[PDB]
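Priority: low. Protein: Abp2D Receptor Binding Domain R86E. Input follows.
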Amino acid sequence: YCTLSSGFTTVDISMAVGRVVVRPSDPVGKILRKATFPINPNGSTLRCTSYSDTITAALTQNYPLSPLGNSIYSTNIPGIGIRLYEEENATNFSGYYPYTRSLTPGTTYNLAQGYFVVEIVKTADQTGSGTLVPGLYSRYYVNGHMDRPFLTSTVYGNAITIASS
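Result:
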C-alpha cells in the first residue's frame, strides 16, 4: 500500500494546445501538432510497502485506441487522435500513456522533472473540425490513491481546436 505525504498536491497540466490546422494532403499518422507543457514538481511525495504497488499513467476519456494504435487514441473529432506522454533519465518510468509500472517498497517517490507532451495525430484520411471535448485526459497515480494523482492533464473549454481545410 502507498502513503501520500501530508498536504500532497496534484499537479494539473492544462492542455492548451491551441488551433491545429489539418490539410487534406496531411497523411494518416502525421503528428499534426506536438505541444509541450512544463511539469513543475511541488514537493509532494509518497512511499509504498509492497512489491505489488504500482504507479499508473491512465487515460480517462472513454475514447478507444485509434485504428493506428501505438497509444494514439481517438477523440470526439473524426480522424483526429491524441497521444500523451511524459518527457528525465528514467526510462523505466517514461513511455506513452497508458502504462503501469512497479514501485520499490520504501522508496520515496516524487513527481519526476520534465515535460508533459500532447500529440495531435491524423488518424483517418479526412478529419473533422471542432474542439476536443473538455475534462481530464490523464491521471498519474499510485494504487489506492486514484483520487490524488501525482499529475493530471486536463482540457478546459476550447483549448484544443481542430481546423480541417
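Residues 1-165 form one domain. The chain has no helices and 16 strands.
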